[PDB]
Amino acid sequence: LDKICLGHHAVANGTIVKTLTNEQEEVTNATETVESTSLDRLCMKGRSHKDLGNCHPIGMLIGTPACDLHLTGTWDTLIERENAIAYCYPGATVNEEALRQKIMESGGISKISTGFTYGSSINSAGTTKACMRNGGNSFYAELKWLVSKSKGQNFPQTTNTYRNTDTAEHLIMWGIHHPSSTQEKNDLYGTQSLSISVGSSTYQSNFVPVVGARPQVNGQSGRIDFHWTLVQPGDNITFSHNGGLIAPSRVSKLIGRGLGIQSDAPIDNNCESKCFWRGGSINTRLPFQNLSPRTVGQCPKYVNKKSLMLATGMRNVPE
Amino acid sequence: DKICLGHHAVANGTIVKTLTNEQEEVTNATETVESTSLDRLCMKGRSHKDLGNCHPIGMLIGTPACDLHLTGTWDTLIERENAIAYCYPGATVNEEALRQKIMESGGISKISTGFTYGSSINSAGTTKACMRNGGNSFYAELKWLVSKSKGQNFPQTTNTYRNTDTAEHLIMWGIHHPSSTQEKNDLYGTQSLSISVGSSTYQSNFVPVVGARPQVNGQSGRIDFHWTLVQPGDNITFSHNGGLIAPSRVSKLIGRGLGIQSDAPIDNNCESKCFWRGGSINTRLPFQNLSPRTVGQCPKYVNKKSLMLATGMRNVPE
Amino acid sequence: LDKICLGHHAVANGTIVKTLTNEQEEVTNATETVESTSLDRLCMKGRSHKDLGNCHPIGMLIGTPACDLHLTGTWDTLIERENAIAYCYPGATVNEEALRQKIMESGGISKISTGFTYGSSINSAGTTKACMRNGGNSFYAELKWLVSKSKGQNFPQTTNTYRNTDTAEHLIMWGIHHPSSTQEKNDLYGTQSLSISVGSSTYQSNFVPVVGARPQVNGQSGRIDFHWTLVQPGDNITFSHNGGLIAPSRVSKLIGRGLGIQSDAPIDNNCESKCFWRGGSINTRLPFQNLSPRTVGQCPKYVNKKSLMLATGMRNVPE
Amino acid sequence: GLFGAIAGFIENGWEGMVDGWYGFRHQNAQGTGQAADYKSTQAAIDQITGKLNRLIEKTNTEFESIESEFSEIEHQIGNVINWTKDSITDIWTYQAELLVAMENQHTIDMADSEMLNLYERVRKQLRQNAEEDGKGCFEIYHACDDSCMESIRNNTYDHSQYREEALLNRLN
Amino acid sequence: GLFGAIAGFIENGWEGMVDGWYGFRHQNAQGTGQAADYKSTQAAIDQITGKLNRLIEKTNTEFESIESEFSEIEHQIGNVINWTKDSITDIWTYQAELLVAMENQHTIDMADSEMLNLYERVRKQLRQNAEEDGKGCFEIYHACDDSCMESIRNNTYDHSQYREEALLNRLN
Amino acid sequence: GLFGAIAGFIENGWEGMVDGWYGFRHQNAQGTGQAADYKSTQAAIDQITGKLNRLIEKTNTEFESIESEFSEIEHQIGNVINWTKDSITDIWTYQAELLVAMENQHTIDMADSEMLNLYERVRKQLRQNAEEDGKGCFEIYHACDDSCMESIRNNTYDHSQYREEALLNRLN
C-alpha cells in the first residue's frame, strides 16, 4: 500500500548538553556560552591611553624621576605595571590605596604652582643620591626638602599658604621627613622640638618627625612619608612648620574620568576591547567567562565553570 | 453547514519581548518598571522629625540650629542638604559612622554628666560663632573649660561619668586646637597640654595642634569631636589640664528609625515605604528605574526604561 | 459495548504547592527545599581542630595565661568562644579585628625567639597581679615589661633589633605602657621624658607613655595598648627606647590555611559538616536554608522563607 | 506557536469578537453567527490574573542608606560600595528581563493551548458526524440549523441523533 | 492544563490505582479490569528523579566570616556588610521561589503530556476499530476479550484482524 | 518527550537528510523519494537564532577595580571584598547553569512541537483518503504519483480530487 512518512534529521555522534531533568541529553548541535580564551595583549584601539611603564601612579603627583614623562597629561585609559616606582627616597603614603584608585579613576592631571618662597635662613634646594636625574642628585620634582641653611641652627618658624583660585578642587601633597638619628635631625633642623601643622577650611592635622635607627632602603635609613588632601575652590591651605616639612612646589588637579588597568600584557593599538584583566583583554560576545574574577570595563560575568553548552538543534536520535 | 473556532484580536497590538523574539505582538500587556515618583515625602502613618537646618551630629553636641532637636522620639528622621553641625568650626572623627548611627535610631535621650569644676576654671566659655538669643553662646551639651584668669595654668583635673543605666550611653567630647600660641596661653596657660580618656572598653590620649589656618565662621581655631560608648555599670574618666571640651550631657539612642536624606516637601496625606532624594516611590510594581539610591521597602532598581509583560494572547489581525 | 479507558492515579489528601499561576495547586506528592533544622553541635569529624576555650586568638600571639596551651600548634579549624580573654593586664590592640581574622584564616602558629637582651639596670621581668600564673604574679609569655632595676632611676636609652632570617614573613607585636599616675611613671622609668621609636624597612612610628587615671580593670588603672606589623623575609626591625616599651621575646609565623568558627556549641567528633554557624552545624543536602544569614564553610544559601515545596507528582484530582 | 493553533491552523484572529478571547463562527441557511466561549476565555484569564498577583508582592526587606546624599564618602569604601551596588543592579536587571521574556512566552503558549483544547473538545463532541477543514473549522455532514449550532456551543449536542444521517452523507 | 488531559478531557483520577501513575480500565464480556502501564509511569518518575538530583548539587564555595559574633564591628563597615548581605538574601529568596514555582508548573505539565502521549498511542493502534468517548475512553466496535485487551495494553493489538467486523458495527 | 513525536512515536531520525530539519519520505509505483520541508525547518531555526541573538546582548555596565594586583589590600576590607565577590560569583554561576538547562529543554520541546505541527498539517490535508500507521506515516488508499506526492508537500493536495476512490479502497 502507498505511503508518505514524516521525520527529522539526525547526525552520527551528537553533542551532549544538560537539561533540567537530564545530565546527559544528546542533541544534533550546540554552542559554548563560557569564554575560556583571552588575548594576551591590551587592546587599545580607539583609546587615548597612557602606559606608565616604570612609573607608579602616586609618583606622577610627587614627581619621582621614573615619572618625568607622566607629570601632566590626558587619557581615557591608564595602565599600571608591576613593580613601578613611587618612592626613590624610601617612604610611604598615608591612605595610599585610596589615592592610587583616585588617580586610576581619572582622565588627566594638571599641575599648578604653589608659589612658596623661603627666607635665606631656609635652604630649599637640597637633593639626594637616592633620587637621580641626568647622572646627578635630585629630588621629587614637585616638592622641596627644606632644611636650615646654616647647619645645627633651629629651623625658623615658617608659614606658607597656597590658595586655590580655580573653580575645581586641587589635590595637595606633602612629605614629612623622619630622620634616622638624633644628630642627623639636629644637623638639618636644630635641637628644638619639631612640629608641622596643616590647616584648610575642611582639614587640619599635626605631624612630628619620628627619629630612630632603622634599615637602609635604597641606601637611606631616613624616610619621608607623604600626606594628601583636597583643597576646594576658593579655599586656602596653610602650612606652619619649624622643621621636617617637604613642601609642595606644585599641586595637582585630576581631570575627567578614565579606566585604570593593572597588567603586564603588551599594548596592541590595532584591536579594541572593553574588558581587561591582569592577563590581557577579553573580546567575546559570550555572556560568561571563566578567565578571572578580577576584570575591569564592560565584561562578561565570571562563572565557576569550564563549559556550558547551549543546544542549537533538536534531540539527536541516530539510526 | 460549517462551524469554525477562533480567537479574538485587536487592530493596534502591543510589542513585547520573548525568549525567541524581540518584536512579539500581543493583544495586551502592562508595565513592570516604575518610572514615576511623587516629588514629596509621604509621611502619613509616621512619627517623623524634620531636622530642617539641623545636622544629626549637631543634635548630640547641641548646635544652636539643633535647639529643637536635642531630644525626642520618631520612627522616621529627615535630613536636609546644608544642615549645620558645627557652629564653631571643626570635625568629628568617624563622622559618617556617627551620622548613620543617629539616622538608624528612633529617638534620643539626654542624661547629665554631673561634672563640676574648681573655681580657677571658667566653664561658661562662649563664642560669637555660636549665637543663641543673639548672645555669644556654645554647644548646649558641652562646656568650653578655660582658666578664669587669663594666662593661668589650667589645673590638673579629673571627671568621671558613671553609667548607672541599663543601656549603653553615647558620650562625646571635644579637643580645642587654637590658631596661635597666645590664644593657647590666654585660655589654658603655658604648660604642655595632655588630655586622657579611658573606660574599661576604651582608651585614648589627645594633644592640641596649634597652627594658623583660614577662618571659618569668623574663627581660625578648631574644635574636633570624639565619641565612644559607655557600657552599663561602666565608668569613663577624663584627666585633662587644658583644651578639653567636656560634656555636660551624654546621649542615649532609642529604638529604630528609618533615616532619609531629601529636600522634597513633607506631606501627611500620602503613605509610602520607599524613599529617595527626589521623594517617595509608591508602586505596586516590582521594579524601578528612578534611582539606585533608595531607602525603605522598595522595588529593585533596574537599568531599563520599560519591561512590558504580556496580559493577552499573540495578536494576529485580519 | 466493550470499552477501554485511560487514566492516571490520585490520592485522597494531596499537597499544596506554588506554581507560576496559582498559589494553591494540589499535587500527589512534594518535598522540602529549605532546611529549617540545625544540629546544636560543632561537627568536627575529619578535621584537625583547636578549641580555644577561654583563650582569645590575639592572646595566642602575646601569650596571656588563658592561652598558655595555644601558643603554638597546627589545625585546619580553629574555634573561638564567647568571652575569651586576650588581655590580662588591660589594654587594646590597634586594628584588632583585622588581626583576629588573620589568625582565624590561619592553619597554625610557630614561635621564633627574638634574642633580645638587656643591660644590668633593666629589670626585664616586671610581673603583675592581673596576669596570674600558678597563683602568684606573672606576665604575657611572649613579651617583656622593662623597668629600671632601681625604683626612681632614669631608665636607660636602649636599642634592640629583630632580624628575620627565614623565607616567610613574621608577625611582630609589642606594647606601650601608659602609667596610671606620674609617680608610677617615675617609679618604673624615672623622671625624663620617654620616647619609643620603632622602625623596620616597611614601618615606623613613635609612641609616648601618657600618664592618666583610668577605671580599674583586673585591679589595674594603667593600660598597655598593643601594636603589630609584618616583618618580611630578609628584613630587620629596630626598637629604640628609654621607658614604656613592652618588648617581644618571640614573634609568630602563621602557617597555612584554616576555617575560623565563632560558636559556643559543643564539639562532636562523630559527625561531619562543611557548614557552621553560631548555633552549631548544618548538613543538609537541601540547597536553601532559613537558620541564619551568618554561616561559614560551604553552605546552602540563606533565604527568607519558612517553606518551599517542590512537586514530586502530578496534579491531584480526587473523586 | 507551540500548540499549532493560534498563528497556526487558524489563519487570523477575529477583531469582531469584543466579548471574549475564544469562540465560534458558523455558516448555515439561516446565516452567520459569532459567539464567545465562556470557559475557555475564563481559563486563560484566571492564569494571567495568577501571574499578575504573583508579581506585585515584593520584598518586605527594609534597606538603610549606605551613601550620604549630602556629604562625601571616603574614596576606597565609596568604590567598594559602587562596585557592589552596580553588580546587584546588573543581577536584577538581568532577572527582570528574563522573568518578563519567560512569562511572555508562557502566556502566549498557554493561550495557544486553550484554543486547541476547545477545538479538541468540540472535535470529540461531533464524533463521526463531521470532518476537519485544516483551517480550524468542522464541515458537518447533516443539516445543522441555528438550534443545532447552539447545542454544539453549549455542550449539549448528541452525536447519535444526527449520526446515521451524517454517515449517509459522508459516503455520497 | 496545557495538554488538556489531566483535569482536562479526563474528568478525574483513580485512587484505586496504586501499582502505578498511568494505566487502563476496561469492560468486555468477562467483566472489568484495572492495570498500570510501565513505560509512561517510569518516564515520568525518571524525569522527577532527574530534577531532584539537580536540586542537591553541592556549591563548594568556601566562605569565611566577615562579622564577629562576640565583638562589635565598626558601625560604617557593619552597615555596608548588612546592606550587602540583605541584598544577597533578597536575590536568593527570589530565585528560590521562582525556581520552585517554575519546576512545579513544568512537572504538572510534563505529567499532563505523558497522559496524552499514551492516549494518542492507544488511539493509533485502534485505527478504524474504535471511536473516542471524549472522556478518555475508547468504544470498541467489535468484541474484545481479556487477551484482546492485554494485546492493546502491551502494544500487541493488530487492527487488521478485527477491522471488517468493526466496520460492520460502526455503520450497521 | 513533551509533544510525543521526536524520540516518540517517530522511532528515529534520518541521517540522510542534510538539506533540512524536518521532511518526507514517500513510496509509490515509481519508487522512492525524500525531501525536506522548508517552512517547518525555518520555524525551528528562526527560534534558535532569536535565542542566540538574545544571549550575546550586552550589559553596558562599566566596573572599576576594587582590588590591587600589584600591592596588598588592608586585611579586613580585603575579606569583605572577597566575601562579596564570591557571593556574586555563586549567583552568576547558578544563573548561567539554570539559563542554559532551561533553554536546552525548551529548544528540544519546541523542535518536537514543529515535528508534530507538520504531521498534523498533513493529516488534515489528506482527510479521509489515508490512515495512520502509528510510526509517523499515512498509508494512502489511492494512487498517488510523484506529482501528487509533490502536491501534498507543496500543500496543494485536494482530497476531493481523490476521495470517492479512496473511500472505495478503505471500505472495499
Ligand SMILES: *[C@@H]1O[C@H](CO)[C@@H](O[C@@H]2O[C@H](CO)[C@@H](O[C@@H]3O[C@H](CO[C@@H]4O[C@H](CO)[C@@H](O)[C@H](O)[C@@H]4O)[C@@H](O)[C@H](O[C@H]4O[C@H](CO)[C@@H](O)[C@H](O)[C@@H]4O)[C@@H]3O)[C@H](O)[C@H]2NC(C)=O)[C@H](O)[C@H]1NC(C)=O
Ligand atoms: C547589622 O545587622 C545586625 C543584625 O540584624 C545588627 O545586630 C542586631 O541589632 C542589635 C546589635 O547592636 C541587637 O539589638 C538588640 O538585641 C537584644 C538582644 O538580646 C537578646 O538576644 C536574643 C536575640 O538576639 C534573645 O534571645 C533575647 O531577646 C536576648 O535578650 C534585644 O533584646 C534588643 O531589643 C530591645 O532593646 C531596646 C533597648 O535598646 C528595648 O528598649 C526594646 O524593648 C527592644 O526590644 C535589641 O533587639 C540585636 O540583638 C542584633 N542582632 C544580631 C543578630 O546581631 C547590627 O546592629 C547591624 N549593624 C549596623 C551597623 O547597623
Ligand SMILES: *[C@@H]1O[C@H](CO)[C@@H](O[C@@H]2O[C@H](CO)[C@@H](O[C@@H]3O[C@H](CO[C@H]4O[C@H](CO)[C@@H](O)[C@H](O)[C@@H]4O)[C@@H](O)[C@H](O[C@H]4O[C@H](CO)[C@@H](O)[C@H](O)[C@@H]4O)[C@@H]3O)[C@H](O)[C@H]2NC(C)=O)[C@H](O)[C@H]1NC(C)=O
Ligand atoms: C560611586 O558612584 C557615584 C555615582 O556615580 C559617584 O558620584 C558621581 O560622580 C561623578 C563624578 O565622577 C559626578 O558627575 C559630576 O556631575 C557634575 C554635574 O553636577 C551634578 O551634581 C549632582 C550631585 O551633586 C548630580 O547628581 C547632578 O546630576 C548634577 O548635574 C559634573 O559637572 C562633574 O564633573 C564634570 O567636570 C567637567 C567640568 O569642567 C565636565 O566636562 C565633565 O563632563 C564632568 O562631568 C561630574 O560629571 C556625579 O555628580 C556623582 N553622582 C552622584 C550621584 O554623586 C561616586 O563618585 C562613585 N565614587 C567613586 C568612583 O569614588
Ligand SMILES: *[C@@H]1O[C@H](CO)[C@@H](O[C@@H]2O[C@H](CO)[C@@H](O[C@@H]3O[C@H](CO[C@H]4O[C@H](CO)[C@@H](O)[C@H](O)[C@@H]4O)[C@@H](O)[C@H](O[C@H]4O[C@H](CO)[C@@H](O)[C@H](O)[C@@H]4O)[C@@H]3O)[C@H](O)[C@H]2NC(C)=O)[C@H](O)[C@H]1NC(C)=O
Ligand atoms: C582574598 O582572596 C584572594 C584570592 O584568593 C587571596 O589571595 C591569595 O592568597 C593566597 C594565600 O592564602 C595566595 O596563595 C599562596 O601563593 C603561593 C603561590 O604564589 C603565587 O604568587 C602570585 C602572586 O604574586 C599568585 O598570583 C600566583 O598564582 C602564584 O601561584 C603558594 O606558595 C601558597 O601556598 C603555600 O603557602 C605556604 C607558605 O605560607 C607554603 O609553606 C605551602 O607549601 C603552601 O603550598 C599559596 O597558594 C594566592 O596567591 C593569593 N591570590 C591572589 C590572587 O592574590 C587574598 O589573600 C584574600 N584576602 C584576604 C584578606 O584574606
Ligand SMILES: *[C@@H]1O[C@H](CO)[C@@H](O[C@@H]2O[C@H](CO)[C@@H](O[C@@H]3O[C@H](CO)[C@@H](O)[C@H](O)[C@@H]3O)[C@H](O)[C@H]2NC(C)=O)[C@H](O)[C@H]1NC(C)=O
Ligand atoms: C583665602 O585667602 C584669600 C586671600 O587672602 C581670602 O580672600 C579675601 O577675602 C576678603 C573677605 O573675604 C576680601 O577683603 C575685602 O575686599 C577688599 C579688598 O581690598 C577690602 O577693601 C574690604 O574691606 C574687604 O576686606 C578680599 O577679597 C580677600 N583679601 C585678601 C587680603 O586677599 C579668603 O578670605 C581666604 N579664605 C577663604 C576663601 O576661605
Ligand SMILES: *[C@@H]1O[C@H](CO)[C@@H](O[C@H]2O[C@H](CO)[C@@H](O)[C@H](O)[C@H]2NC(C)=O)[C@H](O)[C@H]1NC(C)=O
Ligand atoms: C638585616 O641585618 C643584617 C645583619 O647585619 C644585614 O646584613 C646582613 O645581610 C647582608 C645581605 O646583603 C650581608 O651581606 C651582610 O654581611 C649581613 N651581615 C651580617 C649577617 O652580619 C641585612 O642586610 C639587613 N637587612 C636589611 C633589609 O637591612
Ligand SMILES: *[C@@H]1O[C@H](CO)[C@@H](O)[C@H](O)[C@H]1NC(C)=O
Ligand atoms: C565604676 O564606677 C564606680 C566609681 O567610678 C566604681 O565604684 C565601680 O566599681 C566601677 N564599676 C565598674 C564596672 O568599673
Ligand SMILES: *[C@@H]1O[C@H](CO)[C@@H](O)[C@H](O)[C@H]1NC(C)=O
Ligand atoms: C445550555 O446547557 C446548559 C448546561 O450545559 C444549561 O444549564 C442551559 O439551560 C442550556 N441553555 C440552552 C439555551 O439550551
Ligand SMILES: *[C@@H]1O[C@H](CO)[C@@H](O)[C@H](O)[C@H]1NC(C)=O
Ligand atoms: C505544487 O507542486 C506541483 C508538483 O507537480 C506543481 O505541478 C504545481 O504547479 C504546484 N502548485 C502550485 C499552485 O504552485
Ligand SMILES: *[C@H]1O[C@H](CO)[C@@H](O)[C@H](O)[C@H]1NC(C)=O
Ligand atoms: C552548529 O553547527 C551546525 C553544523 O552542523 C550548524 O547548523 C550551525 O551553524 C552551528 N551552530 C552555530 C551557532 O553556528
Ligand SMILES: *[C@H]1O[C@H](CO)[C@@H](O)[C@H](O)[C@H]1NC(C)=O
Ligand atoms: C490591558 O488593556 C486591555 C484593554 O484596555 C484590557 O483588556 C485589560 O484589562 C488591560 N490589562 C489590565 C491589567 O488592566
Ligand SMILES: *[C@H]1O[C@H](CO)[C@@H](O)[C@H](O)[C@H]1NC(C)=O
Ligand atoms: C514523596 O512521598 C511519597 C510517599 O508519601 C514517596 O513515595 C516519595 O519517595 C516521596 N518523595 C520525597 C519526599 O522526595
